[model samples]
Target: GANKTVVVTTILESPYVMMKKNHEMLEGNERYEGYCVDLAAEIAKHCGFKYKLTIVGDGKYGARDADTKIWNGMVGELVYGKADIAIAPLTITLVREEVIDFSKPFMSLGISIMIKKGTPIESAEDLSKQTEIAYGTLDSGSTKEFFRRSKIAVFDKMWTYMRSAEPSVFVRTTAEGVARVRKSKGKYAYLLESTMNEYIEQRKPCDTMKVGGNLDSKGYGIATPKGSSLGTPVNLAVLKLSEQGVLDKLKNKWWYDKGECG
Candidate 1:
């Protein structure tokens, strides 16, 4: 047997991945659709494997417990043989690269700040320079990692303030980050991905806009178990899709047109 039955675990991320509304009305994989769906399909075509889709447990996405060194959620799923592949916004961090192999990043973007229009904050420089205008990132995810890992002049300074800001729960997802900015009335600015920020700016409640430049360089890649057989074909499929513009088209279909981000 050629491992015809593999498990693919994912997270409930918007624009990137999600179940369609009325998903319960459907059956099997029919309930699933989004950017990652196409990516997984193309990769599976190349890899020649059939898989079952399951959402991760814990629901924390992926992160290592600095204290325990154990990973959670999708990371946990992949580590514990719960899934054979993960196609989401997993960052290619140094520590993570050691634990799992990342396919050649098919898309590149970076952390950005989203602020409501008419807000006094115009840049990371401005965000760190003033205390009256508060700006921060998600409490325990990629958004926080950018702020935590930054060392560049402006971002390092900006990080100093955000790391210690009170009243937590910065945001759970990109949409929540935008919602916080929209509701803060010139007070809160959310740090997130450039693609996500751009995606939100064009939608309803488009009042929120990305300001300043990106916080740092980053890329999105598919993840496979370390030494897994699916690595090469997955990478090649991504290259093919990227060259054929399938990636960008899917980005637009989900980020630009879908109500998932709404």
Candidate 2:
């Protein structure tokens, strides 16, 4: 009713955020659907702000170009002031956190590697110990970035090999990585958000499953520009919903609950 608007960046992903089927028939948040869809709407309600949800013009999330070391995509969008808020399945990594501020983890999980059935490769342990099977992640994403920065005892060893691999095992999209896994039967593994793995497990042809507990720890957050005032309320809202179990309920209801697929 008044002249107030906040720009938020979003990505098109299943069960998290995507344009609604009736999106053409509606406007604003009414035209969007998914897990993040519900969460963002609630946050706006609690904070009282009119927001504009726009898909990132660039299709990727965030990554550092080895030569340039500059972040891009929706993560870059926030840094560049293209948007004030971002609530996709954006990972809260130490590097990204150094640049942009993130709310208290709205969702917690890890980087799980997935492979096809009867692939002989069963865990990250198996994948790391052998040379026959190769592993990688979506380029400029949390999984790849994690491997790049890891200096810990275990990941450091894996990181060294991945960094200098001759074939350069990286994909531009998670779907491409997933395809490599299915096509190679077991020779390739893809590291990705655990939430996406769970959703895929419940889908048809569920031969894939997460292996090795998880190579790293991470959580999704509502990211803001480093000094935005929305930090406090956003963080509080996340904790409140998480404690009350609304977040899990929403995820289960939308994905696990049986209904028509849109």
Candidate 3:
């Protein structure tokens, strides 16, 4: 255990993880860069460990199969002993906490609405009352789970519509959801985390906008297998970095400093 390299499982989400322009010539972690890559370096430095970053095979944040009950994506990698830690934009939730350990929140976010610029939508309530503008969430993540389990009036109604919407309103990824919004001519909206919504708002084309207050407050944390010895130290390191403003600096570095949109 002393010399073993920690395996870090992550995903390829924009502003979080993305292939470098010359990724074909790069190898290992060098082929990738983003907020999580930078955060992983800081965490490793503070926690005193060597780690290898590996993207999740299924390209999911993690979710349990309804029938087989097997976990998929980054959570599955941790559960199956394929990885030592997960340093990604993985959300901290009770379902995930039951199976894996998470550091104290490294980033705070909330479910927010993304719409094509000039869409009449301004709030969840407004979306719920309209059938012309179809809406959905990324499948198998906290945002979808939030709507599925919510009893709040507007959310419950929205869930009912999304669950049975013809042609299936749920999207397989955030990018797909965003693309749908951009291509739908103000007829579709995507509900995703505030951090991602804001980042995309700054990207080129700038055809999308995040409107209205977030639906709920939450945070993203580093994940480790349940009962991991690394959990305590990782948690402490996040708090230290957060208080030191490292997290804020990284956010600006990726989301604004290198921003493509003017």
Candidate 4:
């Protein structure tokens, strides 16, 4: 196939795709800096391709509308040819695997609990047993979907509460959820992926903490549309980077090397 610049779909989540301090003065990919930005450069280098990093238009990770059967966010971008690839913290799940392709995980993570430093909750069981400390997950993403589809007693109970909470526990983004936790003064907790939960723990204020163990095990993958030719090369490149410790180095550089809490 004749080469064209790859259009990479991503989301602007902190430490993954944040606008630089002087973003207005920068251009193209130079306007952003984060773990995925660096990873995209490495993937392009090893795969011998030129690419552009475009933030996902919908500002979502990706989820399908149950009634319309249409997708949104980075996943939709790939399915509808709006972009050539997605390199972000997009999770790998059986449902997503049906419509798009995901490379072997570049980073491993699991759903976790984010609580205000003084929140009384200790685990999913604790959250399930209480009504005072309301909790929720990012709407339209894997964490909420996990609870929605779960059969386990604890998670099922928690889902029941979140789905019907009168004040609306669902949040549109991770930052909003984190902000809610900070401002709620122990009345609200956020359920999010461990990768992000850990990252926020190192940021300023440091008023939040990740409690208990992860609820499930999963990994983030490089995504391409179904049957796209880029799948094979991208998958191999991720594996090569993982084996060479390049993935670990990027994680440290973005999450800890520049850590503010320390």
Candidate 5:
């Protein structure tokens, strides 16, 4: 039932969703905290339903396989009736829209380059044809998919290497990918959403910085199953919160106010 405790699927990607530092000291939804966690509370309160925050079992944003004819990640959870809704840094993409419904975008972002300070790589174009520095996206999510399906020369070129690199270049999470960059000592670059790139730059051990501009523009949305009544209300809640500046406030609370970097 839509009125019952909604199972909201999310991923742990910095400002979007993460376990609270003192989460063990809390309980239930209170055990977790982040921008999405707050947005989930607002959406549930406005939509008149209780909800439980759950991590996507497969840890992907959502992707479909042509050969297997199956979906995975949060999208799959919603598609198969395993999750009632999804609210995370999940990008609103055309392919996903065909299978699941999405609320209006909750945040605007684009892919950006994360690099160690003094790294020679300045842009995606530079990294595309060079082999000196390695680069890759998260193991899954729109960022990975973007490069995979893109026809653009720079992205397509970079994808070719990442697609076949020995030992597999993709990282399971943003933290892992960023860590790779840190440990690589200017030998690796992590491509991820600008929101995450900027947020991480503001975090401690501030040697990493978002380089150049975003590679592409897109937005993140709250998602629900197709034909689910919750879609309309969730969309309305998102619009209302956005109009009243709740979104901006939440962004400031998580990203700017808590910044550990100067």
Candidate 6:
């Protein structure tokens, strides 16, 4: 173990994980930083291993292709042994659990509507019933999967429309989905995790807001290759951080400290 290093895979999801800008001048872990970055440090310290943080090759959060039977994104990296673990805003879902193991959720949240300053859309139900506006979720993430598997009539209807929308409602990244809201001029609403909605709501321009409330409840977690030895220690580290107030401190540092909302 003198020189053992764990390879950690992550994605660039704003406050969770992001390029450090000066990253071009820095090397290794110093090239990036954020909530997930800090959390990875804590986990590595507690788990007693050095690690290298690398962005996922495909820039995906990992989704299974129905026909290809192939896995893509950070999840794929872990499942195929490309990386030792995943430390990002990755969600812990049932299907993912079958191929991977997830630590207890680090942050709890739910899906919510992101709207321009004066959109008339009130809820998922409201958005689903209208044609003047279009709505969709980030592609290849748990948000989309939730709607796809949902049994609720409202969500079922919402998913049906998203599937058949002529221009293709799904966007490849959260930023693209958010940009759609800004450019659509009240013609679009993006469905995303409430945690991100709250963060963006506090960002500059301040022309957008999270309306109504979260559509469903869930949490984000650290993921590991199925049955990996790292799972137990990393899971323990997250729980310890939660109990010690570190998680709360990090949330305040990233979210409320820079909040632009009065």
Report lDDT (Cα) of residue 244, candidate 5: 97
Instruction: Give the lDDT of residue 111 in candidate 4.
Output: 97
Predicted model with the maximum TM-score? 4
User: Residue-wise lDDT of candidate 1 within 156-213, one digit each (tens)?
Assistant: 8877777677876366666677777888897888888787788777777568778888
**Residue by residue across 47-162, what tens digits does model 6's lDDT show?**
89999999999889989999997899999999899999999988888889899999999999999999999999888889978898989888888999999999999999999999
Ranking of models by lDDT: 4, 3, 6, 5, 2, 1
Provide the lDDT at 77 for model 3.
Answer: 95
Q: Please give the CA lDDT of all the candidate structures.
A: 0.77, 0.80, 0.94, 0.95, 0.89, 0.91
Per-residue CA lDDT of model 2 for 163-262, tens digit only, reads 7776877888766877788888787877788888777666666767676687667788899989988788888888888888988888887668943322
Alpha carbon deviation, residue 240, candidate 4 (Å)? 0.6
Clashes of each: 0, 0, 0, 0, 0, 0
User: TM-score, each model?
Assistant: 0.91, 0.89, 0.98, 0.99, 0.96, 0.97
Q: In order, what is each prediction's RMSD in angstroms?
A: 2.3, 2.8, 0.9, 0.6, 1.4, 1.1
Task: Give per-residue CA lDDT, model 5, range 61-82, as digits (tens).
Answer: 8778778989988889999999
TM-score result, candidate 4: 0.99
Candidate 1 backbone clash number: 0
Rank ordering of all candidates by TM-score, starting from the highest:
4, 3, 6, 5, 1, 2
Using TM-score as the measure, name the better of candidate 1 and candidate 5: 5
Better of 4 and 5 by TM-score: 4
Better of 3 and 5 by lDDT: 3
Candidate 6: residue 214 lDDT (0-100): 88
**Candidate 3 TM-score, C-alpha based:** 0.98
TM-score of 2: 0.89
